Design a binder for this molecule. Structure first.
Ligand code: NA
Ligand code: NA
Ligand code: NA
Ligand code: NA
Ligand code: NA
Length: 157
């Protein structure tokens, strides 16, 4: 059922959250987890994506799921973004890109005459046993949160 295999150590990485606490992926055992990676706090696409997930939170709650957004912005940046937008789910400050590398979302583009790395907008659905059962890479924001919810409902039933 897995579409991606993560290194075992990934599940024990301490993930710094908005609000000053930590989590780990193993700590989420027993429920579905949506992990959405986005390139930059407080930009148009990333704000739209976060607000779309936020608006659907009760539907994720029905289906037995939690959401985590992830970028490499600082905890303080995330706190500002969450407060301004009213998000009711946490944001991971993956400052060292450990989680991003585990999910292979750091992609390289030939541009500016160089090799340039960056976060590719991507989302994953993690089962209650920690299996990555669906992936969306190079995400288009419009309609995305709706599509993720529909997929979750399909998998969870
Ligand atoms: Na921390
Ligand atoms: Na950290
Ligand atoms: Na995403
Ligand atoms: Na989980
Ligand atoms: Na897919």
């Amino acid at each position: 059922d897995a579409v991606l295999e993560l290194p075992a150590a990934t599940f024990d990485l301490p993930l710094s959250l908005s609000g000053g606490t930590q989590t780990t992926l193993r700590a989420h055992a027993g429920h579905w987890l949506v992990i959405y990676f986005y390139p930059k706090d407080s930009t148009p696409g990333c704000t739209t994506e976060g607000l779309d997930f936020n608006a659907l939170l009760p539907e994720f709650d029905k289906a037995g799921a939690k959401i985590l957004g992830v970028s490499r912005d600082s905890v303080k940046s995330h706190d500002n973004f969450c407060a301004k937008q009213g998000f009711a789910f946490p944001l991971v400050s993956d400052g060292d890109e450990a989680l991003c590398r585990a999910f292979d979302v750091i992609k390289e583009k030939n541009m500016y005459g160089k090799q340039v790395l960056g976060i590719e907008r991507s989302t994953f659905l993690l089962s209650p046993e920690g299996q990555v059962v669906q992936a969306w890479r190079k995400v288009k924001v419009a309609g995305h949160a709706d599509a993720v919810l529909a997929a979750l409902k399909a998998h969870a039933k």
